[PDB]
């Protein structure tokens, strides 16, 4: 019989969650609170005509790939932005409060859709525009396809003069610098053939800012967007990182160090948000845990549920390269957090892609409520889950939190005390809304996988609850159902025996 001790104080260590923690990248069955236009296709993508390139994905490809995916009404293919206003117009209409536009900056966009890039057509080449960050010269809402230039700030000017800006309720709040670009060379080498350097992307990050700020001052920047862990260290071992990186501990630090003293020197922050991807390097049952994982490996699905203690516990080291070789970098969240208050301090966090795998099993699901209840506690400001409508029990994890009994019942927006004697059995998350305790809402996880877990709660709070609504998900279904009321509470005290891999969302009143 497994036994824990759950303990919560709402009237100790309240911090506001982040509303953004819950979005996503691709158009999920689930409600999500953040929309993100990026990834690879988004790298060469021009505004002006709607055309991009699939880079390594798809054969260098350029094509309207992202008009078709983004089910723009063909009668706007050709109309400036349509997959940007079409991908912000739907996010405006399914309430969601932030939508993350990214811009070019590797150096070039399709000119056209014709199809494959030769190596011969690499940029610059009659395949390619040149991107420049400051038009220098009056804006068009009209702009000219014809000329080699694709303008970012006359491209944010298009959107502003739509939408209204970043601080009015129908502008897109933040825009992100290109997408991992330690990958440029290895996704789009027929735009950006070299590897880039840490002066490059640096140079580059401050000029695109200050370009989009001109336009749009109450707009969030979000870079580097890296790949991944050897991005966050080295930039993916840049060419000049010998040289730029003396006296850091890693890229991180030199990044916001210099999008710092370059904010300094022009007079307003250009750094808004440190965005970075996190795909899970823990491995389990002889493999990673995303990217194809078997859900029929009991072994990775353990691993799997045991992952998302790598972004905060300083006890949990997991079976990757990571966990092996980078020990004085775990655990991630507060090495990334500690570096801001270092660097650049009051600058934001946001993973803007992440996946933890078995997105059609139950342990995908609870990793997922897990990785989510975890961004709320630790302070991150925006996340967007990268992966398709197929993963089910990811989006039973997203809908716990936003949209639990279908008519929208959330998470509350902050943040308490809640601790449990056993971090690897079980996971808890606690909130209120605002400053009222009134309606306690917690996240109970439990990861034991073939026994139930009894919990024992102790809740410190100004009010006394009398009863408890649960609302959870298991391997019987993703989806989300009511589940019979916890009733016997005494003074603030109640037992609830969850039974194994069982998600749940209990809200005291
Ligand atoms: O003439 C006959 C009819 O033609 C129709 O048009 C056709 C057209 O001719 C044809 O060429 C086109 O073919 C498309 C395929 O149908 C479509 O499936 C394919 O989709 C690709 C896409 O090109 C590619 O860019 C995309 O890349 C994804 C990648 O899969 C994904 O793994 C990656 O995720 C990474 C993140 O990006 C990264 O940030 C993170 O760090 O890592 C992630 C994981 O690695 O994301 C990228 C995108 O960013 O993959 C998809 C799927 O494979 O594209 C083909 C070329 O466009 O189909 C057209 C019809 O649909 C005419 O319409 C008709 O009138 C004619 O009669
Ligand atoms: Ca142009
Ligand atoms: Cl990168
Ligand atoms: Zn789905």
């Known amino acids: 019989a497994k036994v824990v001790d759950i303990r919560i104080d709402t009237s100790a260590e309240r911090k506001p969650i982040s509303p953004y923690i819950y979005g996503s990248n691709q158009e999920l069955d689930a409600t999500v609170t953040a929309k993100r236009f990026g990834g690879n296709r988004t790298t060469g993508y021009n505004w002006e005509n709607n055309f991009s390139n699939a880079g390594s ?22 109309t400036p932005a349509s997959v940007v206003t079409t991908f912000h117009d739907k996010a405006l209409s399914k309430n969601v ?14 000119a056209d859709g014709n199809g494959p890039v030769s ?8 395949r390619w525009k040149e991107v420049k960050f400051e038009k220098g010269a009056p804006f068009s809402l009209t702009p000219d396809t014809e000329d080699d230039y694709v303008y970012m700030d006359e491209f944010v000017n298009y959107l502003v003069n739509k939408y209204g800006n970043a601080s009015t309720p129908t502008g897109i709040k933040g825009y992100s610098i290109d997408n991992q670009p330690a990958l440029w060379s290895h996704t789009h080498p027929r735009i950006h053939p070299d590897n880039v350097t840490a002066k490059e992307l640096i140079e580059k990050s401050v000029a695109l800012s200050k370009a989009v700020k001109k336009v749009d001052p109450y707009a969030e920047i979000f870079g580097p967007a890296l790949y991944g862990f050897a991005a966050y260290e080295t930039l993916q071992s840049a060419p000049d990182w010998g040289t730029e990186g003396e006296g850091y501990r890693w890229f991180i630090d ?27 390097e823990a491995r389990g049952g002889g493999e990673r845990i995303c990217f194809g994982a078997d859900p029929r490996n009991i072994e990775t699905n353990k691993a799997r549920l045991q992952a998302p203690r790598t972004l905060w516990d300083p006890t949990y080291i997991e079976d990757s390269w990571i966990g092996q070789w980078k020990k004085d970098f775990l655990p991630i969240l507060p090495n990334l957090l500690d570096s801001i208050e270092k660097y650049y301090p009051g600058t934001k966090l946001a993973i803007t892609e992440y996946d933890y795998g078995g997105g059609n099993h139950i342990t995908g699901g609870i990793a997922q409520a897990d ?16 992966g398709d409508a197929s993963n089910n029990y990811t989006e039973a994890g997203i809908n716990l939190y936003t949209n639990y009994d279908g008519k929208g019942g959330k998470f509350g927006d902050t943040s308490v005390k809640c601790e449990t004697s056993d971090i690897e059995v079980s996971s808890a998350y606690a909130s209120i809304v605002g400053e009222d305790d009134s309606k306690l809402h917690i996240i109970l996880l439990n990861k034991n996988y073939d026994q139930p877990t009894t919990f024992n709660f102790s809740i410190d709070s100004s009010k006394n609850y009398t009863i408890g609504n649960v609302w959870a998900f298991d391997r019987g279904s993703s989806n989300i159902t009511q589940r019979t009321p916890i009733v016997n509470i005494k003074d603030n005290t109640f037992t609830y025996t969850v039974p194994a891999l069982t998600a749940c969302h209990i809200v005291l009143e």
């Open 57 to 78: 994905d798809w054969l260098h490809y350029s094509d309207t790939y992202l008009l078709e995916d983004g089910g723009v009404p063909k009668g706007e293919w050709s």
């Open 254 to 280: 030199y990044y916001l160090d210099k999008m710092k003293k370059a904010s300094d020197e022009e007079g307003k922050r250009l750094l808004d948000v440190l965005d970075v991807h996190w795909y899970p």
């Open 119 to 126: 190596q011969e057509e690499t940029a610059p080449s009659s």
């Open 97 to 110: 409060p932030y939508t993350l536009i990214t811009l070019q900056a590797a150096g070039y966009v399709s």
């Open 371 to 386: 990785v989510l209840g975890i961004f709320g506690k630790y302070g991150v400001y925006l996340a967007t889950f990268w």
